[PDB]
Amino acid sequence: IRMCKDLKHLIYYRFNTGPVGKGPGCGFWAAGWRVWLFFMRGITPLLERWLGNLLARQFEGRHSKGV
C-alpha cells in the first residue's frame, strides 16, 4: 500500500507539470496491477494450504488429539 501510494505520488508529480492541476481524472493502473499481482503470486500457496487445512478440518473433522 505504501508502494501504491508512492507510485501514485510519482504519477501525480510527473503528471501535474503544466496546465493540469490536482483534478480527479488521473488514470494509470499498470504499476499497481503489477504490485498486487506479484503479491498475488506470493500469497497464493499459503492461501491454498490454509484453505486445504480448512477443508480438511471441515470434512475430515478436527483431530482433537492430533499432532
Added chain:
RNA sequence: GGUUUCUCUUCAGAUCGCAUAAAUCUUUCGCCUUUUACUAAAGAUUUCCGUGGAGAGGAACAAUCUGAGAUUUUUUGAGGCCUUGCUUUGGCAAGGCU
C-alpha cells in the same frame, strides 16, 4: 530434405525471469502484558507465477519446398643427335653439336 501448433518426456547449470513475490527455520532488532498478527536486516532453506534447450506423439495447413550438384619469355616443345665412362641396355657419368 515442410510449416504452424498441441501434448508428453528429459536436461535447465543463462538476468533460465533486462521480472519479482511469499512462506518456514536460525537469529538480531523495532514494537511489546501475552497469542497469532508484528517491524527490517542477516543466515539457512523452500514454494508460487514464469523460463530455456532437447526428444517423442498428435493435429491442421505447405504438400512440393528446401538443399546439394595452346602455342608468343617463367607452368608446355630447343626438339633431336652422337662419342668416351658405364652398359646398371628405360639409357646412364663426360665432349663437340644445330
